[PDB]
Amino acid sequence: SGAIYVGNYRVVNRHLATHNDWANLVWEDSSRDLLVSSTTAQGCDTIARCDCQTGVYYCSSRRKHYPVSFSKPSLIFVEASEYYPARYQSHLMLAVGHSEPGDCGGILRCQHGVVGIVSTGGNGLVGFADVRDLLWLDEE
Ligand SMILES: CSc1ccccc1CC(=O)N1CCc2nccc(O)c2C1
Ligand SMILES: [Zn+2]
Numbered sequence: 248s249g250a251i252y253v254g255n256y257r258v259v260n261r262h263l264a265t266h267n268d269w270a271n272l273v274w275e276d277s278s279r280d281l282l283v284s285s286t287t288a289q290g291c292d293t294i295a296r297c298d299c300q301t302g303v304y305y306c307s308s309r310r311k312h313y314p315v316s317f318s319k320p321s322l323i324f325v326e327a328s329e330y331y332p333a334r335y336q337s338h339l340m341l342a343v344g345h346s347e348p349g350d351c352g353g354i355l356r357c358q359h360g361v362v363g364i365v366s367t368g369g370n371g372l373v374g375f376a377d378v379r380d381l382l383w384l385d386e387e
Contacts, residue, residue: 249305249352251361252290253384258283260351260366260376262330278337280330280366280376283384294384295359302357304365304375308347315342317355317362320377325367338377339366346373 251258259268261275261282268284275282303314323339325331329348340355346368353365355375367374378384 248349249307249354249364251292251294251354251364251378252286253292253294253361254386255286255289256283256384257286257290258364258378258384260364263351277331278335279339280336281378283381292354293360294381295357295362295379296382297357297359297379299357299359299362302355302362304342304344304355304373305353306345307350307353309345313344315344315355315373317342317375320380323367323374325374326369328367328369336367336374336376338380339374340377341372341374343371344368344373345371 261280264282271284273283303312317340320338322337325336327333351365355362363375363377366376
């Protein structure tokens with residue numbers, strides 16, 4: 248579990264969105280595993296606007312933040328899990344690192360701010376769903 252709180256938005260994995268998220272929906276995209284809902288209070292996270300390929304992510308199954316090198320956002324072939332059938336997930340970045348289903352949520356960050364959130368893994372690999380191209384998160 249885990250979310251990004253920026254301005255009056257809450258960014259979560261689409262497959263982990265609650266009824267309150269769907270009842271206060273701003274935007275969702277199944278191909279990216281992302282959903283954004285509105286919040287009453289303002290959040291403290293800042294979104295990175297960059298092309299960094301090194302950062303640090305939070306892994307709840309280890310209670311640790313790991314430094315990682317990660318690929319550029321791409322259309323990444325992901326095998327069946329409890330939530331999506333094997334398919335092609337877009338705007339996905341991969342890194343070598345430990346992860347369990349429960350970790351989805353965890354923030355990947357660089358020197359500029361939040362880059363994305365865990366979205367996939369297995370095989371000793373993890374994927375984050377990128378958010379750096381969602382410029383509208385910084386306003387309205
Ligand atoms: C951070 S989510 C996660 C973490 C640890 C393990 C599995 C997942 C779920 C997932 O994404 N799957 C399910 C199984 C799996 N296994 C091997 C190759 C895969 O493509 C997939 C895709
Ligand atoms: Zn950066």
